Design a protein around this ligand. Structure first.
Ligand SMILES: [Ca+2]
Length: 184
């Protein structure tokens, strides 16, 4: 009897996913199609790259050696929006917070902090096999915080009347700064 092995391969990770064995008679047409196996793996996110099983291939007349044929896949990808989830828990969004403290010259507190927030977004490409999104560059190079008006405190003037700042998309946290109140 002759033997044939059809090997289903992830060609991105060079990993064998399954092997199907068949036996037959010399010169018999190999009674196999890669169609079901291709359908199955495409259902798990793969995309056919190269099917090396030849149409109408016969079993050989070589007892010593088996026949091997690979069916090679890549990972199917699709572009996704910033709101898309990812199996590795990474996100297409981030929100940074600006914090402004209000103090007198000795560091004692003059008023309660005010805060503001900015949000950045990034598109990505989802790998259908892994469920993981490869996120691209942040779409906005920077974002500006809403203007924060320092409170009016009788008898004092703030070092900065209205605080306007921005964050760059590479920042991991927004700015934290102090407005100082000086006596009139
Ligand atoms: Ca053989």
């Amino acid at each position: 009897m002759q033997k044939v092995h059809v090997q289903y391969i992830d060609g991105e990770t060079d990993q064998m996913l399954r092997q199907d064995d068949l036996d037959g008679y010399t010169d018999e047409t190999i009674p196999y199609s890669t169609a079901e196996g291709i359908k199955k793996f495409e259902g798990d996110g793969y995309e056919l790259f190269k099917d090396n099983f030849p149409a109408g291939e016969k079993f050989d007349n070589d007892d010593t050696n088996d026949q091997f044929y690979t069916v090679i896949f890549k990972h199917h990808r699709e572009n996704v929006d910033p709101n898309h989830s990812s199996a590795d828990g990474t996100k297409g969004t981030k929100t940074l917070t600006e914090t402004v403290h209000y103090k007198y010259a000795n560091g004692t507190k003059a008023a309660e902090d005010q805060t503001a927030q900015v949000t950045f977004t990034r598109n990505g490409v989802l790998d259908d096999v892994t469920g993981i999104v490869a996120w691209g560059k942040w779409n906005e190079a920077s974002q500006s915080y809403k203007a924060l008006t320092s409170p009016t405190i009788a008898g004092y003037a703030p070092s900065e009347a209205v605080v306007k700042r921005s964050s760059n998309s590479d920042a991991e946290q927004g700015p934290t700064l102090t407005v100082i109140y000086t006596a009139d």
